[PDB]
Design a protein around this ligand. Structure first.
Ligand SMILES: [Mg+2]
Ligand SMILES: [Mg+2]
Ligand SMILES: [Mg+2]
Ligand SMILES: [Mg+2]
Ligand SMILES: [Mg+2]
Ligand SMILES: [Mg+2]
Ligand SMILES: [Mg+2]
Ligand SMILES: [Mg+2]
Ligand SMILES: [Mg+2]
Ligand SMILES: [Mg+2]
Ligand SMILES: [Mg+2]
Ligand SMILES: [Mg+2]
Ligand SMILES: [Mg+2]
Ligand SMILES: [Mg+2]
Ligand SMILES: [Mg+2]
Ligand SMILES: [Mg+2]
Ligand SMILES: [Mg+2]
Ligand SMILES: [Mg+2]
Ligand SMILES: [Mg+2]
Ligand SMILES: [Mg+2]
Ligand SMILES: [Mg+2]
Ligand SMILES: [Mg+2]
Ligand SMILES: [Mg+2]
Ligand SMILES: [Mg+2]
Ligand SMILES: [Mg+2]
Ligand SMILES: [Mg+2]
Ligand SMILES: [Mg+2]
Ligand SMILES: [Mg+2]
Ligand SMILES: [Mg+2]
Ligand SMILES: [Mg+2]
Ligand SMILES: [Mg+2]
Ligand SMILES: [Mg+2]
Ligand SMILES: [Mg+2]
Ligand SMILES: [Mg+2]
Ligand SMILES: [Mg+2]
Lengths: 131, 63, 394
RNA sequence: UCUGGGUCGGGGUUUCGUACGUAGCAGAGCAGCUCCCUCGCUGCGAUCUAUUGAAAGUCAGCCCUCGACACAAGGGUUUGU
RNA sequence: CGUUCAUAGCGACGUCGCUUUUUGAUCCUUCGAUGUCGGCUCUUCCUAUCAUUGUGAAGCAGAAUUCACCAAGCGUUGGAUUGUUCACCCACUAAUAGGGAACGUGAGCUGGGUUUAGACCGUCGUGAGACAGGUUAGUUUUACCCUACUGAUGAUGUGUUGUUGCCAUGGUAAUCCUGCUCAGUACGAGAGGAACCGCAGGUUCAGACAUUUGGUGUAUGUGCUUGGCUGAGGAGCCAAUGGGGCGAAGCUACCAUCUGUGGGAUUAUGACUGAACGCCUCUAAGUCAGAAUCCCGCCCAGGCGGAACGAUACGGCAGCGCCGC
RNA sequence: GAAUGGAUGAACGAGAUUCCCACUGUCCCUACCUACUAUCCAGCGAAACCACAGCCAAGGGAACGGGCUUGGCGGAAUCAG
RNA sequence: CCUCUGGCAUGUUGGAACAAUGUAGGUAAGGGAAGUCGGCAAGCCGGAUCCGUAACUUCGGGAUAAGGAUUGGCUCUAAGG
RNA sequence: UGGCCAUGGAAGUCGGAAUCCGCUAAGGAGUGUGUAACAACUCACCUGCCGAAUCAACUAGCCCUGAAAAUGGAUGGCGCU
RNA sequence: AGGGCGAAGCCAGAGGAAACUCUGGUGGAGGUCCGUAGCGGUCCUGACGUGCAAAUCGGUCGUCCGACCUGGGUAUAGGGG
């Protein structure tokens, strides 16, 4: 119901955020950000809570050499919450996911940002810590 | 508006100001300003640093 | 050939000759339409941008994720000491336009105001409206005055009051008080005029014009930035590193064959000090100034029902590059045009406001009052004196 | 002459992080002398504690002073229905 | 052909056209030189409309759709390979439409490619040498003139001066999307599966701003530290800003925050009354609804265009304003 | 395609490519700072270039006009770009 | 890089400002070559001591391969004539 | 009158050779709709009302559709019914 | 300049029945490596481009005991060197 609000989005296309679920992937080469019309010369950028296409660069060879959807869960670029607290996360991080928002993994190492948790429920269910 | 305390210095942090850090261990710190946060990230033991609350408690200043 | 990859053009043509504004005091380019029905009122005011700060508030837009969640919010303090009406001035409709018809000035006029009428006051003998004010004490003059007012009753349509600021009461350097025509919008012109004739020489405070949680339009001149290159002034792409004759430029001004450079092409020139009318700036707080019943009432500014301290909106060490706001002020949401100290025209909206957001009632929870002259960490000096304890300066 | 604006000073604010000096039974050890006492005394000795959120800067485009000091109708060129 | 049915969509055999974003013809212009491809950057136009608004069509149940109309307001992206144009692939998207401006744009760049001289290879040549055959290395000049544009002083007028104002004319701006709700509802055998009004937000664009987060930082602010140098201490300096922490103010970032509006005429279209044509017809006279259009509004600038009001040279020589003659 | 040398090849190369790690304002996307300029002033003081000149639309015209035709129009003297 | 001896007056001028463009330096959040014909440019790396060192090889090399750790100040000890 | 060819079904009706008589006031061995095929529907001859012209096929005048380009624009301009 | 690598020869020790082999030193080879002066002149396609300059400047670069650099003297002269 209640919609997202924009947040300072510090993952341009070209990032390798570390996969923080138990798949067997280690990295997630963001090749594109979902739901970006975009402008000339401008890199598509995914903050936290953003869907994303993601090649795996290192990990299991099942996953390597193909594209998966993914979600950004933490991010090192400090966004501002509506309550006027800026927040950043120590590492950029995501999870491999399917089109309809379900995880293909099962358990999320590390904390998930609540911008991502509220917007992705199945991620939120497998997230131990939030914010 | 729950005023929080700076995880380095000890000062209160009013709603507007400062910044919130979320380490992957899964615990969070609040910093009044960057000055605190830099000493935190460079691993300065705030009890060694005069102007913090933790130092002055340690050295029994005031009272 | 066509440009390969499309892109929307940089900057708006709806804003140009991007030149240094003639005026300093921002003109009200249109007052609202006076319905004749609702009672008489002033449509505009003239404040001063003293400074910014936080607020905190519970928000009540149901549906949002932020419903019943305390957000923070930036705000401008526009110090607005009461204006003095010193004139009225009748207008009449014509097919040519809207001719000024008759200006009746008050009797007594301050040196605050009289300042304005000379380019050099030190050197003048201050002889303005001297033979004028003779009119206000005889049979002949008073009669002519009445006939002028009667004529305005017969003929005029639009009536604007002339008021001016109380430059006296500010922390600014200048004494030369800004005049301004403000339009009286209300009932019939005869009623309209006798209201302004009653208000003559009198104070008018801010609360008489505006009310709380009201969208108003801020009108002013932008913070000026001098000569600026095209990359600053139009936000054109920088060219790359290797460019031989510089790179904060536009490469192709224009095609060959409209063999002129067009008005739509980006060139370097004056950036800033433009006239600009930003609309829909909601008044969060109309704040009561310092006053005396026995001691000072400094509290009445930045104290809220939920805070209850003894603050004023003045932060520690004052608003920077300004002063103390010792007078009544408004507190708009967000930034507004111009610099610190800049004279600023407020104006009631041109527009029937009926959006959820524009009828939202603002209850403030907390005004930040920490210094802006560095990273402040104390809300008030008494709090600081508590926290620190005693210092060597004792 | 709303006596004013200005310089200096004083507050406030704020930045940095605790000055010099002095004292110390703090100080890894070392030495000189002896009362060869090794807590003897005296010296060297990074650093430490205390004095000390100290010192220092803070409009030059921060805020208030009404404290000290002078200085404030002065000059030149104009223009007429 | 389309089960059936020439024309929903198509369309053979024939035929009539437009177009100059293809390539040819041609050689009128330029050989006392008009800088020869592509990309970047920027502006503007066209429509032969991909999307978006409003609509007619279907072989349109819904969803998806192709066909057509008004229509160019607003958009039309990120990459891999290639010097490329072109091409192709991945990804996102509402859509990844097509062009023009000396095949826009070298005193705007770049110079990868063509296209000197150095060299290699292949084929051809007795050979010098040749090759829209491949390769590698190879100088990208000048603006202070005039205009145009950008901003900047001014100009004639109004007796002089100041004021607060009006407004001729120019410009002009907003965009599209998601989610929730309607609703697993209409529609449909089911599978699937809408829409209007609301509500919450976001894209791109525009205009600001610095409370906050970030950036800068020679306040050369305050520590810390290298080498040297004032005999040392203290206090300092030098090393083209010695180096580095932290850093006020100030600039400043979708890297922070705020704001972005209302009418009128109508177009396509669908209608009314209604003849022509004893009926019927949206039309012939007459009338209605009607839009990302157009015109204005708001918004920016403000005319060899005006306005009301103020004060109008005590003087040491002054000089003027009215009035009447 | 075999001393018009063929195939090879460690070491070496301001030689020609391709990828990876690191690193970065190359870029997303631009921003702030410093010095010397440019700027204004005193003094000093060149050059190239120059038919006349210098606002446009369209027309025709040696088939892309500043000048011609028909329209739009036109306001001293200048400054930085 | 800083200093004494000796030598100079900043390289054919001065002053006031601190705009745009530049020339020469720097710094940048998150990402890290997505830029571009092409990592061009800049950045990383750098000294020393101690470990540790691959493929390949003409057995000489490769080799500072790579990859690691340490480094200051102070007060002592031991070892070298 | 399931007329005949065609069976895959065409008793008027995908198509084609046929193609007349009766009743007749008069209805084609059938214009279509549609059917597996019928059915059902629909398309002359005649009346009832109303009250003088009505209707077809060609043809040529003006006008209109056909009729899409990139700086803003040209019956020469203003304009003109 | 200053460093690096450490070739032959030489010493000792250990093994070997012999052949000889290992280990530690010493030794200081080389159109050897780094790198100054020197000599050069890669890239920035940087600066400059009516220049400082009719080819210069800055950083970045190649080489730096050898087919090394370099003064003076001397030889070769135009279809000739
Ligand atoms: Mg691009
Ligand atoms: Mg296009
Ligand atoms: Mg270049
Ligand atoms: Mg501040
Ligand atoms: Mg057929
Ligand atoms: Mg041709
Ligand atoms: Mg030319
Ligand atoms: Mg069309
Ligand atoms: Mg061209
Ligand atoms: Mg050109
Ligand atoms: Mg060129
Ligand atoms: Mg080339
Ligand atoms: Mg060649
Ligand atoms: Mg000049
Ligand atoms: Mg000292
Ligand atoms: Mg030097
Ligand atoms: Mg119609
Ligand atoms: Mg209508
Ligand atoms: Mg309408
Ligand atoms: Mg207009
Ligand atoms: Mg051969
Ligand atoms: Mg042979
Ligand atoms: Mg051969
Ligand atoms: Mg000419
Ligand atoms: Mg100098
Ligand atoms: Mg000099
Ligand atoms: Mg000289
Ligand atoms: Mg960066
Ligand atoms: Mg690219
Ligand atoms: Mg690339
Ligand atoms: Mg390089
Ligand atoms: Mg190697
Ligand atoms: Mg060059
Ligand atoms: Mg030059
Ligand atoms: Mg010189």
């Amino acid at each position: 119901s209640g919609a997202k609000f924009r947040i300072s989005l510090g993952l341009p296309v070209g990032a390798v955020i570390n996969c923080a679920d138990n798949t067997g992937a280690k990295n997630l080469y963001i090749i594109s950000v979902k739901g970006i019309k975009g402008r000339l010369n401008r890199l598509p950028a995914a903050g936290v809570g953003d869907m994303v296409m993601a090649t795996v660069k290192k990990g299991k060879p099942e996953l390597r050499k193909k594209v998966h959807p993914a979600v950004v869960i933490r991010q090192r670029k400090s966004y501002r919450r509506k309550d006027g607290v800026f927040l950043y996360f120590e590492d950029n991080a995501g999870v491999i996911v399917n089109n309809k928002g379900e995880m293909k993994g099962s358990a999320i190492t590390g904390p998930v940002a609540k911008e991502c948790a509220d917007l992705w429920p199945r991620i939120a269910s497998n997230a131990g810590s939030i914010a | 508006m729950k005023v929080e305390l700076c995880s380095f210095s000890g000062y209160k942090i009013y709603p507007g100001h400062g910044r919130r850090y979320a380490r992957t261990d899964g615990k969070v710190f609040q910093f009044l300003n960057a000055k605190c946060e830099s000493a935190f990230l460079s691993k300065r033991n705030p009890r060694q640093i005069n102007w913090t609350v933790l130092y002055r408690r340690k050295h029994k200043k005031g009272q | 050939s066509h440009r390969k990859f499309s892109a929307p053009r940089h900057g708006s043509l709806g804003f140009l000759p991007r030149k240094r504004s003639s005026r300093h005091r921002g003109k009200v380019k249109s007052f609202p339409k006076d319905d004749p029905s609702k009672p008489v009122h002033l449509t505009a005011f003239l404040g001063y941008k003293a400074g910014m700060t936080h607020i905190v508030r519970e928000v009540d837009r149901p549906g949002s994720k932020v419903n019943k969640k305390e957000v923070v919010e930036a705000v401008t303090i526009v110090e607005t000491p009461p204006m003095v009406v010193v004139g009225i001035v009748g207008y009449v409709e014509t097919p040519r336009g809207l001719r000024t018809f008759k200006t009746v000035f008050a009797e007594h006029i301050s040196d605050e105001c009289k300042r304005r009428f000379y380019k050099n006051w030190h050197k003048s003998k201050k002889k303005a409206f001297t033979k004028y004010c003779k009119k206000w004490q005889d049979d002949a003059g008073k009669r002519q005055l009445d006939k002028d007012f009667s004529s305005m009753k017969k003929y005029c349509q639009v009536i604007r009051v002339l008021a001016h600021t109380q430059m006296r009461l500010l922390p600014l350097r200048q004494k030369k008080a800004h005049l301004m025509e403000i339009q009286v919008n209300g009932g019939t012109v005869a009623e309209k005029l006798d209201w302004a004739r009653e208000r003559l020489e009198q104070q008018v405070p801010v609360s008489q014009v505006f009310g709380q949680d009201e969208m108003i339009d801020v009108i002013g001149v932008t913070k000026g930035k001098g000569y600026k290159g095209v990359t600053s002034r139009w936000h054109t792409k920088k060219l790359p590193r290797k460019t031989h004759r510089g790179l904060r430029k536009v490469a192709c001004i224009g095609a060959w064959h409209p063999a002129r450079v067009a008005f739509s092409v980006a060139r370097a020139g004056q950036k800033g000090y433009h006239h600009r009318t930003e609309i829909n700036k909601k008044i969060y707080k109309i704040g009561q100034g310092y006053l005396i019943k026995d001691g000072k009432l400094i509290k009445n500014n930045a104290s809220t029902d939920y805070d209850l301290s003894d603050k004023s909106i003045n932060p520690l060490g004052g608003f920077v590059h300004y002063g103390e706001v010792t007078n009544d002020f408004v507190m708009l949401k967000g930034c507004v045009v111009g610099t610190k100290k800049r004279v600023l025209t407020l104006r009631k909206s041109l527009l029937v406001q009926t959006k959820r957001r524009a009828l939202e009632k603002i209850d403030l929870k907390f005004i930040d009052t920490t210094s802006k002259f560095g990273h402040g960490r104390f809300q008030t000096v008494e709090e600081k004196k508590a926290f620190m304890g005693p210092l060597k300066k004792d």
